[PDB]
Structures are given as structure tokens and as C-alpha cells.
């Protein structure tokens with residue numbers, strides 16, 4: 277049941293790679309492989325260490341917001357791939373004589389770096405144009421203005437709007453989510469402990485002295501640790517009771533007319 | 544028809560009517576032989592009323608109840624499991640095959656041009672026997688077949704497009720997808736023509752650039768038919784239309800700053816011509832001002848005519864365009880995306896049911912009689928049929944209450960009026976002795 281879990285996979289990568297980084301105390305290994313593994317291990321240790329901050333109360337809401345934004349980015353990745361591959365192969369054909377666009381894969385990585393707005397207009401477009409070093413100059417400037425309109429303007433603002441919507445959705449229900457994570461942590465931890473330890477550690481009542489201060493280190497830890505629908509439903513209940521009582525009263529009045537005595541008002 | 548009437552007026556009774564269409568077999572969820580049956584007898588008309596007939600004057604569009612539920616925004620009925628199984632059956636009947644055929648007929652022209660680009664150095668003239676610089680062999684068997692595939696795909700695209708010309712009859716003129724197909728087909732023809740007529744390499748690569756741009760740009764429009772992707776395409780459409788509405792304010796403000804910098808900074812190379820100055824200010828829009836290179840270092844060498852006016856123009860440009868205008872575009876994008884995601888879950892199922900009800904009107908009636916079904920049987924205990932697992936991994940109210948309140952209060956005041964009339968009748972017919980005067 278643990279196969280569809282990324283935390284297990286991160287632990288596998290960390291443990292194997294940290295084994296290979298340390299093995300020269302038994303078996304001699306070339307230094308290239310050793311530092312190649314040390315890089316991946318030091319990356320994934322501190323990357324995995326964010327997942328242990330989810331258990332705290334002052335931190336876990338940022339981790340769950342980061343999770344939501346990252347999943348939405350994973351949903352947009354296919355539009356990213358196709359649009360970026362379009363612009364990358366177009367710049368590969370247009371700007372072949374320059375060093376950043378020599379290979380197609382280098383051109384794709386260059387357009388991915390140009391995504392944020394580092395276009396390098398003067399170095400790659402203008403100064404080759406003033407030295408007659410651009411084949412197809414008009415097509416090149418038209419490609420430049422089309423790339424500037426599509427990717428850094430439209431797509432980035434799309435990501436910003438998606439992030440704003442997701443963060444508003446998360447912070448709609450933050451205060452319930454915090455206490456839900458705490459009670460889930462305790463009710464999952466309690467199912468594994470033995471029963472005699474539960475009988476020996478629990479309590480049934482607490483006594484709090486508000487005048488006496490609590491027990492320096494605790495002060496530093498405290499510094500680091502720092503409805504219409506139900507109303508209309510009640511309205512509906514009261515109106516239903518009202519119409520029931522009025523029906524009974526109407527029946528009694530018809531009984532009065534049925535049993536009434538009429539003299540000197542007939543015909 | 545009363546089913547459409549129930550969808551229009553009382554949808555919560557249609558919910559119960561759909562609840563009668565779900566049958567549980569053994570009422571034991573642990574059994575491996577346990578199943579449930581879905582019946583689809585109320586969701587559509589008989590198929591004879593669908594096709595136009597000289598005897599039957601009236602017609603009905605296919606998927607009747609689903610179209611009626613889409614036009615009345617009854618999403619709680621669309622999320623009912625009988626409707627989900629109905630769309631799943633309708634997709635596995637004929638939708639997947641027609642969709643994969645329509646995608647493959649385009650991908651057959653898409654792939655070989657990308658192969659032909661990434662396996663030939665640009666700028667060189669290439670022919671069926673190889674690359675001319677002397678002739679380079681050892682790839683000619685691949686290059687020849689790729690050029691033949693692109694040529695054949697382009698001429699069959701012409702034939703399909705001319706069929707749509709003689710079919711649609713000038714209603715297709717206000718459509719950008721037809722125009723993109725025209726550009727793709729003509730330009731891919733011109734990129735491949737040296738297997739018949741010799742063409743200079745400059746025109747050949749000039750056409751190859753435009754073709755490889757517009758193939759992958761057009762290929763985004765075929766992702767709109769999927770469910771996991773099309774909402775991004777429609778959000779991109781909305782944002783791009785709003786940018787097209789703001790383009791005139793862009794043009795006037797940018798032309799102001801461009802001609803001002805053309806007059807001020809004439810001695811520098813990026814502002815030599817007026818059109819180059821306009822393109823330079825358009826590039827400076829995002830925040831790449833080049834303060835040190837264009838403003839400060841000419842000032843410390845006494846190379847600026849009008850220095851005070853130049854720095855005032857710099858601070859005015861920095862305030863207007865990268866601060867105000869970009870934040871205006873961000874606010875417009877946030878509002879439009881919130882508006883789209885207000886109605887996402889209805890829009891997805893609406894696109895799916897529109898795709899099926901548009902595809903079904905063209906198929907012949909005997910094929911409809913031979914492919915459809917009336918009931919499905921699902922075994923929840925037995926897993927479905929590796930490749931399917933990879934495909935599943937890649938594929939992963941106050942107003943009505945106050946209205947009811949108003950109805951009940953109106954009934955209440957009607958009954959109280961009748962009761963008041965009866966009490967006045969009691970006083971009219973009552974007998975009074977020993978209480979008179």
C-alpha cells in the first residue's frame with residue numbers, strides 16, 4: 277500500500293546515496309562518484325526535512341499551500357512542454373549561428389531560461405542586427421515580439437491567478453485544518469502504544485492556576501511558538517408548526533358551524 | 544416531453560427517478576461475484592427520432608436528457624453515477640476511436656517535420672538523395688520517407704479543407720483554426736518541394752521556420768477535447784482576449800515613450816532609428832531598463848545631451864509602464880481566472896457532452912444500432928484489465944429555500960382568509976338572547 281508514496285522514495289534515495297558517499301572507509305571509490313553522490317544526498321536531506329515540519333502548528337499550513345500550488349503546476353506541465361517546444365525549435369531555426377542556439381536541446385533550455393523575462397535583447401537580437409549577422413531579420417523580430425507577448429506576460433499571469441485562487445481556498449479553512457492535523461496525529465500515534473502505558477500516562481482532570489506563572493527556556497519557547505442557513509432552517513421549522521396548528525383550528529371552526537343552533541336567522 | 548420538464552422544474556424528483564435505475568445484486572460488498580447494474584432507459588429518446596426523416600417531421604438532438612441537464616445547470620444530476628457510467632459507455636462505444644483517428648491523422652504530419660528539422664543543420668539545401676553543401680548520404684532513406692509523409696499529409700489536408708469549403712458555405716470565415724491550417728499546409732508544402740522543383744535554400748528554411756512554429760502552436764487546440772487539459776486552454780483563451788482588448792492603450796503609451804527616448808537618446812546605438820527605439824521600449828517593458836549602460840555611464844562621460852530631462856524621463860517610465868500597467872494586467876488575469884474557475888466542473892462535462900452530441904449526428908444509423916447498449920454491469924470487487932494502470936496514472940442554495948418559504952407563507956395566508964370568512968358567517972347567523980342592548 278506504500279508504493280504510491282513519495283516520502284518512501286525520498287528515503288530510499290537519501291539512504292542509498294548517503295551509503296555511497298561514505299563507503300571509502302571500507303572500499304576505495306574514485307572521488308568523482310563520491311562527490312556526485314554527496315551532491316544528491318545533501319540536496320535531498322534538506323529537501324525531505326520540510327516534510328517533518330508538517331507536524332508542527334506554526335509551519336504546516338505553508339507546506340500544505342506549497343503542496344497545492346505544486347500539484348497545480350504539475351497539471352499545467354503539458355501546456356508548458358508544447359508551448360516551450362514550439363518557441364525553442366523556432367529559435368533554433370532562426371538563430372542558429374549563435375552559441376546559445378547551437379543545439380536543439382540547448383535552445384530549449386535557453387527558452388526555458390528566457391521564460392522569466394531575461395530576454396537578452398541587446399546581446400542576441402540588436403547587436404547581431406547592426407552587424408548584418410542575422411539571417412531573416414524581420415521574421416526574427418516578429419518571433420521576439422510574439423514570444424514576449426505569450427510566455428512572460430500571459431502564462432506567468434495565469435500561474436499567478438491560479439496560485440491566488442488556491443491560496444484563498446486553503447485559507448478559507450485553515451483553523452479547522454490545523455486542529456484536524458493535530459488530532460489525527462494523536463489518534464494515529466495512540467493506536468500503536470501498549471494499553472498499560474496508556475493506563476499509566478493518562479489523566480482525567482487538570483488544575484490550572486491563572487495567577488501563578490508557569491515555569492527562561494519556557495519563555496524562549498513561547499516566544500518561538502508565537503450562519504444564515506441555520507437561522508432560515510429554524511424559520512422553516514417554526515412556520516411548519518404554525519401551519520399545522522392553524523389547520524387544527526380551522527377544523528374546530530367547521531365543527532362549530534356544524535353543531536350551531538340557528539333560530540330567528542333562517543331563510 | 545415530461546423528462547425534460549422534470550429536469551427543468553423539479554430536479555430532486557429526477558434524482559429519485561435515477562435512483563430507481565441503479566440495481567444492487569446481492570447487497571454484499573465483500574463478494575467477488577457481486578455486481579451492480581446501470582439501466583439507461585430514461586436518458587435518451589429512441590434513435591429513430593434523432594435522424595431527419597421525411598415521415599417524422601419532428602426531430603430530437605441525441606443525448607436528450609443530458610443536453611437538458613446541461614442547459615439548466617443541474618450539476619448535481621450530472622455527478623450522479625448513472626450519468627457518469629452513461630458517458631463512460633458512450634466514450635468507449637465510438638468516441639475514443641474517432642478521437643484517436645482524428646489525432647493520428649494530424650500527428651502523421653506533425654512528427655516527420657520535427658524529425659526532418661532536428662536531423663538536418665539549418666541553412667543547407669537538402670534533396671531526396673541528401674544534403675547539398677558534394678552530397679551527404681547515410682540519412683537519405685529517412686529523409687526521403689519523411690518528406691513524402693509531409694507532402695501527402697499536406698495534400699490530404701487540402702482535400703479535407705476544400706471539402707469543408709464546399710460544405711460549410713462561408714460560415715467558417717470567422718475562424719482562426721481554418722487559417723492556421725491554411726498556413727501550416729501551404730508552408731509545409733513549400734518546405735518539401737525540392738523533391739520536385741529546385742528552390743533556393745533561403746526560402747526553404749524561411750518556410751520551415753514558420754511551419755515548425757505553427758504545427759506545435761496549432762497542436763494545443765487538440766488538447767481541448769481532453770478532460771485533464773482543456774480548462775487551461777480556455778483560461779489562456781480568456782486572458783489572451785483581454786490582452787487584445789488592452790492593445791490600443793499599449794500602442795499609444797508605448798509610442799509616447801518610444802518617440803521620447805528616440806529624441807533624447809539619439810547618439811546611442813539602440814535608439815538610432817525610431818522603429819528600433821519602439822522595439823527597445825517594448826523590451827524595456829518587463830523591467831530590463833539597462834540603467835548603468837544607457838543612463839549612468841554616458842552621464843559620467845558627458846555624453847548625454849539634456850541630462851535632467853533624461854533622468855526625469857527615466858523615472859516617469861519606471862513609474863508608468865513596469866509598475867502600473869503590469870499590475871493592471873495581473874489584476875485582470877486574477878479576475879478572469881476566478882470567473883472561469885467559478886464554473887469549471889460544469890464546463891468540463893458540457894464540453895464532453897457537446898463533443899459526443901456533435902459527433903453522433905454524422906454517423907449512419909445502422910452503426911448506431913450496432914454499437915449502442917442499454918445496460919451495463921459493473922463488478923466492484925474484480926479489478927479492471929499494466930497499460931491500463933499507466934493510463935490511469937496519466938489520467939489522474941439559500942434562494943430555493945427562501946422560495947419554498949414564500950410558497951408556504953402564501954398557502955398560509957390563503958387558508959387564514961377562508962377561516963376569517965367562516966367566522967364572519969358565524970357572527971351573521973348567531974342567536975343572541977339575554978345579551979342584547
Ligand SMILES: CCCCCCCC/C=C\CCCCCCCC(=O)O[C@H](COC(=O)CCCCCCCCCCCCCCC)COP(=O)([O-])OCC[N+](C)(C)C
Nearest residue numbers: 282283323326327339340342343346349350353356384388
Ligand atoms: C525544459 C524543461 C521544462 C520542464 C518543466 C516541467 C514542469 C513540472 C513541475 C513540477 C511537477 C512535479 C513535482 C514533483 C513532486 C511534487 C509532489 C509533492 O511533493 O507533493 C506532496 C507533498 O507536497 C509538499 O508540500 C512537499 C514538498 C517537498 C517535496 C520536494 C521534492 C522535489 C525534488 C525533485 C527534484 C529532482 C531533481 C534532481 C536533480 C539532481 C507529496 O505528494 P502527496 O502524496 O500528495 O502527499 C503525501 C505527503 N506525505 C503524507 C508524504 C507527507
Ligand SMILES: CCCCCCCC/C=C\CCCCCCCC(=O)O[C@H](COC(=O)CCCCCCCCCCCCCCC)COP(=O)([O-])OCC[N+](C)(C)C
Nearest residue numbers: 418419422425719720764776777779780783786787790825
Ligand atoms: C511594438 C509591438 C507592440 C505589440 C503589442 C500587441 C499586443 C496584442 C496581443 C495579442 C492579441 C492578438 C492574439 C491573436 C489570436 C488570439 C485568439 C485565440 O487564439 O483565441 C481563441 C482560442 O484561444 C486559445 O486558447 C488558443 C491559443 C493558441 C493560438 C495561438 C496562435 C497565435 C500565433 C500568432 C503569432 C504570429 C507571429 C508570426 C511570426 C513568425 C480563438 O478564437 P475563438 O474563435 O474565440 O475560439 C475558437 C476556438 N476553436 C473553436 C477554433 C477551438
Ligand SMILES: *CC(=O)N(CCCOC)c1nc(-c2ccc(OC)cc2)cs1
Nearest residue numbers: 544545546547584585587588589607608
Ligand atoms: C423526453 C425523452 O427523452 N423521452 C423519454 C424516453 C423514455 O421512454 C421510452 C422521449 N420519449 C419519446 C417517445 C416517443 C414515441 C415512442 O414510440 C413508442 C417512444 C418514445 C420521445 S422523447
